[PDB]
């Protein structure tokens, strides 16, 4: 049976299934939530608004990121994220593939274990994983060797990998990102 | 001894005591003979272990234990002992090998279109049913009219006939005997009146269904009536609310009424000219939607018989060319073609060919008809005011007026044939014959089945109710003390959720009112009313490798399935009262008579739900008598039916429910003598004193009475 894909991040949700090319849905990682009034009696007021239909809705929607620097800061909101990955987006029913999440480094342990928690209770994977996003990124890049540098929308870090031997001492971390760029913008 | 006056139909009607003598004592065993399931019988008798030419081994709570050789030859299925599917299935397919085409069901009269002419109807030698009950005599529907007979001149109440047709034949026979038998009892009949002109209604009311080639559309309810001392009198025919939606939408290997198509062979180029029209269907889209012909039947033939009944009706050469006028305009509107106005929101036209033909024909204007179309005007207090309009809704006009054009020509020839049909002195009682489609369970399931099986449960719950009322009746008869929740309302009340103003076609309407309203946002709004606090209320199950619903509702006939693309172009009509007047007015002078006689809300729901209950009020001041055709194979061969197509028809037949609902009985009622007589191995008092549950029975008046699964073991 073949198994999801689902790289968070902390600006966009790239989910697909292990063996395309390409992931199959980005949308933003954003959950919106109406601030004004609401006049117009049986227009269908849905409580929230994720992804990209919240994007498209954000001029009246006041928006909220529940990743802010690789770690996870609200729990519901990204249960919501990973319900629409999986059911309005990839369309699949999660029972019935393995996951494979992933997460930055030296980040609290806390968040895998409610990663893992998640998963295995309120949607029942058979199986599921973590990996590290340089890892990743140096499998794609189809070496086993070099120092990677990675910089997404919340946190920036270097891994240096030999022979497919990782310096976790030489690993460093640091916090800003592409949405402190947008900030100082 | 009193069947053998029936002789070569004898047979028939019911076996001489012989065979069944040796049939009642057939060595059969309760604990080695089961029913299981199958792939292509799906009910097979059985020896867990079990074999009967193919083994399996299932659990030993779905097995169903065959019923008892005591009464395996039974036309009335109320008096066996274990009440299931398989049971009723083989027990019809036994007596309708042996050939017995009809059956008693508690209150049914379940029927078989047998393919073979047989003299059980012809001639009167069996027709003597005369003064007799339905409970003694071999089960005929000709005493089920006999009994009608009596009983509308006992109580001078009217009588209901109810008979489902949507299968293809056996409803057209049955209705032509019965009515035979009525002309017979209280003496160019008024049946060949009938059969006359038939064939209006077959071109109006009849297309080619998916599951079909001639399915009536509307419902039947033949008034026959009756002196005042119970002499036959003139017949009219009442008829009811008719799938006009037809008229302009069409899925996919289907077609709206014949008429279209008879005329379009071609076969009468007067017509082709009169009404400008071409011979190719893919030119005029309320028609072309889906097939433009079937080749299972021919035109020109249609044409000729509708031609033949026309003639044989009142009808001149203006009632014959200004309805083909009025057929040849609705399929001209069709094509008529508009543009928003440049710049701005307003249709204006782009060719007016098809405004010159239709306005020429019905005797309008076509300046007059393009404006009243673009340009709609209100009564405003004591003022006019246009109305603005864009291209959509003027369209939705189109279609409305189209709709309403059909649907009164269709009524005015139903009271034109009524009329033809009426010469007769002051009368007071008749009988009621209903004739109306059935369920309808396809594998795309759309608004119009949403419709249907809405009407066929409201004649479910009202069999129900009568059934429940009729069997608290006969419970109170013997002093048997026993009460129970309605059966005829109660189980139903929760799945009418359709006609509460928060259901599913009142959210429809809301919608329909509602600005930018979409499938989607329509789909939001029943979930949010409905999903799980509801019960009847699901989600389908769409598996990859079906066509996909959208939601599923528990009916009687199983669970039903429905996919809600496209409804508010089926449901909205928003007619145009310009136009209207325009048609009052017309030259074309059908026209002014259909339309003779201090508006943009209109909905196919709310039209459709009123003529139901209007029918339902028609009912229900009357007494009820339920008929059930059956057809047993689909390649017509006589002799055997296919087990898993009759099942389905049975499920949607709904005697089933019959069967279900005196599960909960006591259905065996049995006499004191015969159980005292066949069960005597050691009045009734001392004889099941002897032993089981005592709730078994209910000792009243000479009758015992018994739950199903009892007389298995005696």
């Given at each position: 049976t073949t198994a999801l894909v689902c790289d968070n991040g902390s600006g966009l949700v790239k989910a697909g299934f292990?063996?395309?090319?390409?992931?199959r849905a980005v949308f933003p990682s954003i959950v919106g939530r109406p601030r004004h009034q609401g006049v117009?009696?049986?227009?269908?007021?849905?409580d929230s608004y994720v992804g990209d239909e919240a994007q498209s809705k954000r001029g009246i929607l006041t928006l909220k990121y529940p990743i802010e620097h690789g770690i996870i800061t609200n729990w519901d909101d990204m249960e919501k994220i990973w319900h629409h990955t999986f059911?309005?987006?990839?369309?699949?029913?999660?029972?019935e593939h393995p996951t494979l999440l992933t997460e930055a480094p030296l980040n609290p342990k806390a968040n895998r274990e409610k990663m893992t928690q998640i998963m295995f209770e309120?949607?029942?994977?058979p199986a599921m994983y973590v990996a590290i996003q340089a890892v990743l990124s140096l499998y794609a890049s189809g070496r086993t060797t070099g120092i990677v540098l990675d910089s997404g929308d919340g946190v920036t870090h270097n891994v240096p990998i030999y022979e497919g031997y990782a310096l976790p001492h030489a690993i460093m971390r640091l916090d800003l990102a592409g949405r402190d760029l947008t900030d100082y913008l | 001894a009193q069947m053998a006056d029936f002789g070569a139909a004898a047979q028939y009607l019911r076996k001489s005591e012989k065979e069944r003598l040796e049939a009642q004592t057939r060595p059969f065993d309760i604990r080695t003979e089961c029913f299981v399931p199958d792939d292509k019988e799906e009910y097979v008798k059985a020896k867990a272990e079990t074999e009967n030419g193919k083994t399996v081994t299932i659990k030993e709570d779905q097995v169903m234990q065959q019923n008892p050789?005591?009464?395996?030859?039974?036309?009335?299925?109320?008096?066996?002992?274990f009440l299931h599917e398989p049971a009723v299935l083989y027990n019809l397919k036994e007596r309708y090998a042996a050939w017995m085409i009809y059956t008693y069901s508690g209150l049914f009269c379940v029927t078989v279109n047998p393919y073979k002419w047989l003299p059980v109807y012809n001639?009167?030698?069996?027709?003597?049913?005369?003064?007799?009950?339905?409970?003694?005599?071999?089960?005929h529907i000709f005493s089920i009219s006999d009994n009608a007979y009596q009983y509308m001149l006992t109580d001078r109440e009217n009588q209901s006939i109810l008979i489902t047709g949507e299968?293809?034949?056996?409803k057209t026979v049955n209705t032509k005997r019965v009515i035979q038998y009525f002309a017979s009892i209280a003496a160019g009949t008024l049946e060949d009146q009938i059969i006359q002109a038939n064939p209006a209604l077959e071109a109006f009311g009849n297309a080619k269904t998916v599951r079909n080639?001639?399915?009536?559309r509307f419902g039947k309810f033949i008034r026959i009536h009756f002196g005042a001392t119970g002499k036959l009198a003139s017949a009219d025919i009442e008829t009811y609310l008719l799938e006009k939606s037809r008229v302009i939408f069409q899925l996919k290997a289907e077609r709206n009424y014949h008429i279209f198509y008879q005329i379009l062979?071609?076969?009468?180029?007067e017509l082709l000219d009169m009404l400008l029209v071409?011979?190719?269907?893919?030119?005029?889209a309320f028609v072309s939607?889906?097939?433009?012909?079937?080749?299972?039947?021919?035109?020109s033939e249609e044409l000729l018989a509708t031609d033949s009944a026309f003639d044989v009706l009142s009808f001149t050469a203006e009632e014959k060319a200004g309805v083909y006028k009025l057929t040849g305009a609705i399929m001209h509107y069709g094509n008529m073609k508009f543009k928003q106005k440049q710049r701005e929101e307003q249709a204006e036209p782009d060719g007016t060919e098809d405004a010159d033909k239709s306005a020429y024909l019905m005797g309008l204007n076509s300046a007059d008809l393009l404006k009243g179309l673009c340009h709609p005007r209100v009564k405003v207090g004591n003022e006019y005011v246009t109305k603005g309009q864009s291209v959509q809704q003027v369209y939705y006009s189109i279609g409305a007026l189209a709709k309403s054009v059909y649907e009164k020509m269709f009524n005015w020839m139903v009271t034109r044939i009524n009329a033809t049909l009426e010469t007769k002195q002051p009368r007071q009682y008749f009988i009621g014959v209903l004739d109306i489609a059935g369920f309808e369970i396809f594998d795309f399931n759309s608004f119009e089945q949403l419709c249907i099986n809405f009407t066929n449960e409201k004649l479910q719950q009202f069999f129900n109710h009568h059934m429940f009322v009729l069997e608290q009746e006969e419970y109170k008869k013997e002093g048997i003390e026993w009460e129970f929740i309605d059966f005829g309302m109660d189980l139903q009340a929760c799945i009418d959720?359709?006609?509460?103003?928060?259901?599913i076609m009142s959210i429809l309407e809301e919608e329909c009112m509602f600005?930018?309203?979409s499938d989607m946002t329509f789909k939001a709004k029943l979930y949010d009313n409905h999903l799980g606090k509801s019960n009847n209320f699901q989600k389908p199950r769409?598996?990859?490798?079906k066509q996909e619903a959208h939601f599923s509702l528990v009916h009687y006939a199983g669970t039903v399935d429905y996919n809600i693309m496209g409804w508010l172009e089926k449901n909205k009509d928003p007619l145009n009262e310009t136009v209207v007047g325009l048609y009052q007015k017309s030259s074309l002078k059908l026209m002014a008579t259909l339309f003779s006689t201090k508006s943009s809300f209109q909905t196919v729901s709310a039209l459709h739900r009123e003529n139901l209950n209007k029918l339902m009020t028609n009912l229900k001041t009357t007494h009820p008598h339920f008929v059930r055709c059956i057809i047993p194979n689909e390649r017509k061969?006589?002799?055997?039916?296919?087990?898993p197509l009759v099942m389905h028809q049975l499920r949607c037949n709904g005697v089933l429910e019959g069967i279900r609902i005196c599960?909960?009985?006591?259905?065996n009622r049995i006499l004191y003598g015969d159980f005292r007589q066949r069960y005597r191995?050691?009045?009734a008092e001392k004889l099941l004193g002897?032993?089981?549950?005592?709730?078994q029975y209910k000792f009243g008046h000479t009758k015992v009475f018994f739950k199903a699964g009892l007389l298995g073991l005696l």
């Open positions: 292990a063996g395309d090319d390409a992931p117009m009696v049986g227009m269908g007021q849905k059911y309005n987006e990839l369309r699949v029913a999660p029972e309120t949607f029942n994977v | 050789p005591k009464f395996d030859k039974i036309e009335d299925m109320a008096m066996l002992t001639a009167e030698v069996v027709a003597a049913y005369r003064g007799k009950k339905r409970s003694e005599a071999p089960p299968s293809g034949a056996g080639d001639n399915s009536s062979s071609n076969k009468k180029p071409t011979n190719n269907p893919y030119d005029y939607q889906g097939e433009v012909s079937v080749a299972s039947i021919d035109d959720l359709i006609e509460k103003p928060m259901g600005p930018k309203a769409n598996v990859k490798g061969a006589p002799g055997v039916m296919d087990n599960r909960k009985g006591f259905p191995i050691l009045g002897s032993l089981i549950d005592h709730n």
